[PDB]
Each structure stands twice: as C-alpha cells, then as structure tokens.
Amino acid sequence: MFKAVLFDLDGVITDTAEYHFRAWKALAEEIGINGVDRQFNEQLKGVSREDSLQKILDLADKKVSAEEFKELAKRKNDNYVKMIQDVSPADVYPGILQLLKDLRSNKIKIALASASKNGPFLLERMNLTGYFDAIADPAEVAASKPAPDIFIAAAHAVGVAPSESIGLEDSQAGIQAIKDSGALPIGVGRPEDLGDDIVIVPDTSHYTLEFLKEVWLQKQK
Ligand SMILES: [Mg+2]
C-alpha cells in the first residue's frame, strides 16, 4: 500500500486564487484601474505575480517604471497577506479533512507540495497543521512544476521515496511533476486540462482513503 500522500494546496486543499483576486482588486482600485472583476480574475489562474500585474496595467494601457512596477507587485503581496487573515476552516475543500484524518489514523504520511510562500500560515488558518508530517519549502526547490523537484522534496521530507506515494493535483503542470517524480498522480478536474493517461476525479469529495487504496491496487498490476 502507498505510504504517503503529497498534496498541492491551491485547487486540492483550498482555493487561494480567490484571495489573490481580492488583493488585485484592492490594488487596482487604489491606483484607479477599472475592470478587475471575477471574470478578469480567471485570466490570472496559473499566472505569475509579475505577469498578473502587467495584465492589470494593460486594462488601462498603463506604462510604469521598473521601480514602480516592483513597488506595485510588492503592494499586491502586502494586500494578499492582509486578505488571507480571513482564511478559516470553512475554506477547506470537501472531503479533504476526512481524508487527512483517515490517512493519519492509518499511519500514512501527509506532506504539502505547494509553490505557496504562505503554505504553513494557510494550513494553520485552516486548522490543518496537526495532520501534516512535512511541508516542502518551495524556497528550497531549484525548479517549479512541471519539474518534479517539489514532489520529490515532499516525499523525502516524510521519509519515503516518491514511488511509495500518491500525489493530488488539479493542474497539468502539477500532474507532470507528480509523474516525473515517480509518485502516482490522481488528478481533480477534467482530462481535457490534465491529460488522458491518469486517474481523474471530478471534485475533491471523491478523494477518499478507500478510493486511493483502490487506485493504488489497480495500478500495481
Ligand atoms: Mg493546484
């Protein structure tokens, strides 16, 4: 049986993209740029802070100095940190808490494999820290997803080889990282987005210890 489960944060444990939205909306409003609404915020899924800021400046065909651009990106981060004070256990996706409990009670290791620079804070706000055996520090990984580095780090941090692990992800880049680490991917989403060659569930309520065990056994033959 698998010995560890390696979780991304955004799209699996919780949605952080909503707080990123509030932070950008606040910045846009402060600098007098209209049009940062929920629809626009879809154009920011998977997008860097720097690329996101440029898309916001583009709403007003606005050109800024490199120093001002840096300062605006900093202010957005300051805003995001304020916004996420409101994260709570209500933010936890369906099925996830019961999964974490069941993994823990069965002595299956639990690690976070997220690019989030706020991962530990966000797990604490959601009252989940006590379930995690490790959090892979994204500041210590050389290469981001789709590179397998973060998943390899998460597995190692709980004393397992990735080959002993399942990885849960909602993004194509993250599924590729799981694959290339040697861990078994189980995606949440659609094959159109994630790939046609892995097991996928439609939402996180399907991530049960029973289902994971079934998939693991089905994939060992
Ligand atoms: Mg994700």
Swiss-Prot record:
InterPro entries from the UniProt entry: B-phosphoglucomutase_hydrolase (IPR010976), Beta-PGM (IPR010972), Beta-PGM-like (IPR051600), HAD-like_sf (IPR036412), HAD-SF_hydro_IA (IPR006439), HAD_sf (IPR023214), PGP-like_dom2 (IPR023198)
Subcellular location: Cytoplasm
A GO term for molecular function: beta-phosphoglucomutase activity
EC number(s) reported in the record: 5.4.2.6
Required cofactor(s): Mg(2+)
Consequence the record notes for mutating residue 170 to A: Impaired, but active with an increase in the affinity for G1P
Entry PTM: Autophosphorylated.
Record: residues binding Mg(2+): 8, 10, 170
First-listed, main subcellular location of the protein, grouped into a coarse class: cytoplasm
A cellular component term, taken from the record's GO annotations: cytoplasm
Induction behaviour: By maltose, trehalose and sucrose and repressed by glucose and lactose.
List of catalytic residues: 8 (nucleophile), 10 (proton donor/acceptor)
Catalytic activity: beta-D-glucose 1-phosphate = beta-D-glucose 6-phosphate
UniProt keyword list: Carbohydrate metabolism, Cytoplasm, Isomerase, Magnesium, Metal-binding, Phosphoprotein
Site (Important for catalytic activity and assists the phosphoryl transfer reaction to Asp8 by balancing charge and orienting the reacting groups) residue list: 114, 145
Effect noted on mutating residue 76 to A: 100-fold reduction in the conversion of beta-G1P to G6P in the presence of beta-G1,6bisP
Oligomer and partners: Monomer.
Identification of the protein by name: Beta-phosphoglucomutase
Lineage: Bacteria, Bacillati, Bacillota, Bacilli, Lactobacillales
